[PDB]
Subunit: 505 residues, 4 copies
């Protein structure tokens, strides 16, 4: 007999676990509890703060929701209008000294005419091939070329994607991209070239909302706060060290044992295999591939520069900087950095020099958040990456050499991106059903390892749907059919369903 027994045990209190917990709490049938090794819930959707008062998410986090249920829970958690700021989804690609509006191909009018020719010629070849194609592309790289042609591929998507995924495009599958035909809109691209037109894919009806305070992490603290505390176990007291799948028992770091009938596990599935002492599963999970993420944060003195303006996130295919993406984090909330009246000494200039003066000066302040990927195919020198990033900011004209840096941040996250390699699906089909047969629902960004359903809303719903499968025999649509859930508005499932309305009568 174990110290604790519940119907459904949830491991992990990032978005996926909290999703499971919210649905269990709403259903209010089977007993349950949720554990996490961290005292603060949120996982990779948490937020750090520097000693100088600059917040950083785990890299650029922008919410786009495909589900009403996720909306209900965020609304419940942060119900006030001033809990949120709304922004247009404004992004550019840095290329040859220019900020090119995303998506890159509709905007090549900004490049020299000789580059436009190369790009259009390439897209003409792709259009003519697509006209007679009768096989689907097999790799990300094939998909990219067929869609963009060679010239456009080489300027952006090819080099950018290696900088993000930390594996060559030729090593990745292309199903995760969805089911749209791999072929150019030659006319649209050419029409904008001819008219000398630029056009971003944002506007009044393409926005996101971002929490007013606490960064992205503020959301998950607040969602977790709506749960009954006695059913949570967050911190050292909730760290899982052993999972005995045959006994349906979990052991915590402090020796506590928890018996379950069903397990929803949201920790990285390779960690789960180890915790299970299951050598066959360990072997299989070791076949999966992932990249690590270095988040670098830079706090800067001054009112926001005109060159920066209302930019949100930015892409960097070029090799004059180590990061693949920069976020103007100070544009997301004025509470992501200190007030103007806060006094801070200059730590260094962007050119790397350090002033002798220790004088604390006032703001205002703005803030840049950078991401650098790492894998066994792309090493990162942790000791110089901060200074390399800062030099990169100078090379891309984001910072002037004389800009005053008042805060810095660097953190490496081991499991950053689950990689859609060619082998991923073959391996997952040997892993997930095996766990399933042991009444283990492994789900989440690393729980089930599928980037195309790896955002905050997807993750949350992987937990919600897992519980719905366990209790109500629901289909796990997000897990098995990402194109299905991503291609529609999912409005049917709500924080208050008919079951609760009828029961309250």
């Amino acid at each position: 007999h174990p110290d604790i027994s519940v119907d459904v045990l949830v491991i992990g209190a990032g978005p996926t676990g909290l999703g499971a917990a919210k649905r269990l709490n709403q259903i209010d049938g089977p007993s349950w509890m949720i554990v996490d090794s961290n005292e603060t819930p949120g996982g990779l959707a948490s937020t750090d703060v520097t000693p100088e008062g600059f917040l950083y998410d785990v890299g650029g986090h922008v919410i786009f929701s495909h589900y009403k249920y996720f909306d209900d829970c965020l609304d419940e958690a942060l119900p006030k209008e001033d809990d949120w700021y709304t922004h247009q989804r404004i992004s550019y690609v840095r290329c040859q000294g220019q900020w090119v509006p995303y998506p890159f191909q509709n905007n090549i009018s900004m490049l020299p005419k000789e580059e436009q020719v190369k790009c259009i010629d390439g897209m003409i070849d792709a259009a003519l091939e697509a006209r007679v194609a009768n096989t689907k592309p097999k790799t990300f790289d094939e998909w990219i070329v067929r869609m963009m042609g060679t010239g456009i591929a080489d300027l952006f998507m090819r080099p950018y994607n290696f900088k993000v995924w930390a594996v060559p495009t030729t090593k990745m599958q292309c199903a995760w991209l969805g089911e749209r035909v791999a072929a150019p809109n030659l006319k649209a691209v050419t029409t904008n070239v001819i008219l000398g037109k630029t056009a971003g894919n944002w506007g009044p009806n393409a926005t996101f909302r971002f929490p007013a305070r606490g960064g992205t992490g503020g959301i998950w603290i607040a969602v977790a706060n709506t749960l009954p505390k006695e059913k949570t176990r967050f911190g050292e007291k909730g760290k899982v060290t052993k999972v005995n799948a045959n006994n349906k028992t979990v052991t915590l770091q402090d020796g506590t044992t928890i018996g379950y009938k069903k397990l929803v596990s949201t920790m990285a599935v390779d960690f789960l295999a180890e915790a299970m002492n299951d050598q066959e599963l360990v072997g299989l999970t070791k076949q999966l591939f992932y990249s690590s993420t270095h988040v670098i944060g830079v706090g800067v003195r001054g009112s926001r520069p005109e060159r920066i303006g209302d930019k949100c996130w930015l892409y960097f295919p070029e090799d004059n900087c180590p990061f693949y993406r920069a976020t103007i984090f100070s544009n997301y909330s004025p509470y992501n950095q200190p007030e103007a009246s806060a006094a801070l000494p200059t730590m260094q200039l962007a050119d790397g020099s350090r002033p002798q003066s220790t004088e604390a000066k006032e703001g205002p302040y703005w803030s840049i958040m950078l991401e650098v990927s790492e894998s066994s195919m792309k090493p990162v020198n942790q000791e110089t990456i901060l200074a390399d990033c800062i030099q990169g900011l100078v090379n891309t004209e984001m910072l002037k050499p004389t800009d005053e840096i008042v805060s810095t941040y660097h953190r490496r996250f081991d499991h950053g991106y689950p990689t859609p390699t060619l082998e991923r699906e073959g391996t997952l089909t040997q892993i997930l059903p095996k766990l399933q047969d042991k009444d283990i629902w492994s789900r989440g960004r690393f729980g089930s390892w599928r980037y195309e359903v790896g955002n905050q809303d997807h993750s949350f719903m992987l937990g919600v749907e897992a519980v719905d499968n366990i209790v109500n025999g629901a289909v796990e649509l997000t897990l098995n059919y990402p194109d299905f859930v991503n291609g529609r508005q999912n409005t049917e499932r709500r924080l208050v369903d008919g079951a609760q309305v009828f029961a309250k009568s």
Copy 2:
């Protein structure tokens, strides 16, 4: 206040309504009731019997299930191995004096050589066109010709489908057919021709099971018998005559009134609109097209003729008989007709002549069930159709002129097939959301009018998924995504889900 109040009212106890009821009963949450104007549940999945003891379903009813939940309920209803008989899915196409195994194109070796040449030439054209196609077909007819080529299309699918739908193939949409590419398998067809091969699409793996007793109707009587009797009102006492959507009140023939919070309606949506006295909906529903079905049954003295054999159902593209489909119903169960020792006089010979003797003689007996369609584009003389069908059986060499007929059956069903016209969706997307805004779930073969999800299993699940949407916020997948439910094994939803397991503890 109404005579009776329930959370969920279900109108109709055909498979769709019975699915809603089974799911409501299993969930055992919201209060509910189910009514039907008929004392015997089953709707179009019911079974009649002649005074001579010959059973007839409402035309050929062969079950292919896409859902475990449906299987669970059938097994619960009729759990004994001897409650069912199993048969291979054996079907042929009557063509030019030959029984051609289905699928037709894989078996044209039975046709004369010069005709094989014309068929293969047509399919080569279709194959060469498919290789460069850059558009999808827009009509059923275009889809047929792209798949088969002209010659093969003209022999079977074109004339057959007119005889089924009672509208030309050029007036129907083709999304209902699913997402497969409209293109020929030229190598499959030529290979069988070169080898002189015939092959049907059946074998030990491709089977169906049929109720031992009571015909298809027997299934639904048994399923209904699992419901709590007190929550059903079947018969004149259960005939709905009025629906007041604004007050959420239903009024029955005998004046009883029922209040509901949510309505699941499975009667034909055009009747529903009439009962709502909603003139706008009456107008829209009159825009829907449907065909009526004449069912003709013929009971025949004699052991099963060799030429008939193990045949199950049969297609008739040709002009020498009015029916589009025949079923050897006596092959489905030995209890679909009287035992050999039962004595019956001969009513007539197949060529229409009087028998030599008027006395009762013994069997054994076999049985043929026929289908003739009717619409505004295809009238049917009810006065002569029985005789025309019988002459058709002689014409197609199903009966010899000498065969002795000991029973006949004819019945017209007004709502037979909901037609996938080009106009169908345009009309339905105006009807269903208006009903939905009134908390009315109109669902079923004519409740929602979509043939591609119009079988017994689809119908049952339309009711189940409607309840699940109402109670648990489930997606109505069968209703909105026919290709999705038909392309997969739906195993998640069970008659005993977690909710019930956890509650029982």
Copy 3:
């Protein structure tokens, strides 16, 4: 017995007859004679002069030679360097207020951007269609739109060709255009649009030579002059009125009879039929279609305007002028108009007004030569066409309203262009063999009626090859295989062949 007998009689001393005569004269074998109704040889390659001293060819005549034999005779006829002027092949298309370098499609960057978009979109459609094309175009019109796409076709080739041929492009064949694939060079076209570039198809090596004196007509007088005078009969005395094909006799206007063994006839073949009093041939030949040509000449006071510059010939697709082509004939030779010291009074201003003064004033002068087509499908008012042309010159900004016109010319040529209609070949393959059966070689622009071998060099060579077929069994390649002779430089036949070298030895 006839007044004269020769082995080979040549009717007509345009380039074609002169070709036959030149080759007969070189071979110096069979006896021969050449006749023409005009005292001056040259036919449609002759030159008129106005009373004011302005020369006009029969519309734009620019030589491009496919044969060394043709080159040899021109060099013999006019052997001095200063007998000729060399110019680049400079041409433009007048469109929407612009002079657009030929070829039109490589220069649409001069048009408004919105129009550029339409043109490129059309040619994209054309390129994608050509990629899967499995049939050849059957009409001139289909060829055009497949090469250019709709938008580009509509701007130039379609409306221009109707103005030229005086029949719609849908009524003409396309074999005469040669064997190039009807598909666009999409990359060349979009590249120039992207680069904002213009480029004509001329340069230091794309040139023509034009005679220093006497216009094109000067070539043929000089060539004719190299023949033995006593073998020529030019003028009223040389006019053929009757051809008796059965007696192999010809009767001239003055009553003289000529007997022949072989006839090379270069008069229009419809005229030949009438002269033969052959009703079958008369019937067939009037099934052939042709347009008449109006040549309009305008002599203008002043040095060459900058806007005109080095332009040679110009195309006019648009409806603001009646002519289809203009030639800056003063650019071809300084001797095509009077010298600057020559004094001439102004006849009218370009806007039609009277000059201030009637006095004779000095030059210099420049000169424009225009062509207007006429057919039963496109009537021409002979009484207003000159004035309409002059207004057309103002509309197209070739002349200012104030420009001083000092000379005018207008002449109508009945047989101008033999039309490549869809029916042409069907008719010619009935006519030519009947004539051939009577030992009549009917050859030339209207002798054999094929425009694609209808220039000066072709015509000449048609005569040469006819003689070579008659004497030496040579293949009539220019006549039967336009694509052959046009796709190579024909170098083998020379004015001095082995035969004459060995003979003189």
Copy 4:
């Protein structure tokens, strides 16, 4: 001064040389002479005879004339109807125990059904690929596969062509095949398979004529006999040993010197270079490739067996015989072998054994002529090739083991086929113009090395057209445009041209 001086010297009196001679003789202008090292004209179109009286051509020689001139000279040489026998062009392919009518692909209905399936599947792939093809094949092999698909290519064209050319198909060009599209007639091939039909490409209009006496060589002896004898020098006395291209002098084996103005050389161009002591030409001509031909003749006792019948020539793709082609030479003329009354002993039986009786016995006799190719890529054991051929006759069921062989013949011809390798043209366009610059016209099967114009008529006309180029500036059409001469009836040039008619008056 040289011993003899002529305007035009012809080296070689095979068909090419004789063509030149015949045209020079007709033109009767320049002086000329023709020399040959063999006393009997004919070259590779000569005929040998065994000591037993069996004639053998140099392999199968079947005339198909593209030219009226060639016909004229054959008619003049052998004017009587009894000088020729006419036959249909009957040929078959030996394949898996059967005689398949040519063309192979239209007759695969003869093969086992499973094999027909593989053949049709392969041709289906070829048809679909051809539908979207936009590049031409670059090798003989690519051409074959695109026309036939893999299955069919592998059964006949691939192995047969290696047996013929003695180089792999992947090493040969495909321009020599003409300009017909490389694509299958899928309908014709499947139609014959469906109807179970066979059909040869012969009939009453597909015929050839063969000389009644003296074999093919009889033609050329008779053609040579029409020449003025004093202008010929045939035999050891006419053997060219030295060519001094700079002095325009030729030296014969007996020391005689001949000066020329123009040289028509028909000897193999590699031999010409050596005789010129031109080291550069030697190096170039050594880059050409050729195969040798072994001719094996077999004289057989007996009347023609039924299994042989009216067969003319036969193809052998398979490994069970070393020859690629057999000719039933005794079907071509009754005078190709001894009369029945001729008494000859049996030399061996077809199984290789000694006959029982060594007595001379009577006929009738029939006769088989075989061809085996050899090259550096395909060596042949010359010592055993006769016996291997005879065993091959047994293996292919052409001879019974007991058949009695009364005569054998074997001869190797070093220069047999000029090979259309990928390199051929790059080499020839360096060779032929360099010879042309020296007033040397090198022409013929090995004179100009183009197999596609390498038959008797082609060769003859290469000689004629060379002369016509030299004297009348004619285009050398056969030499430079094989597709042109092969695609039409060349009727213009006759043995009596206009030149001769006019001169005789």
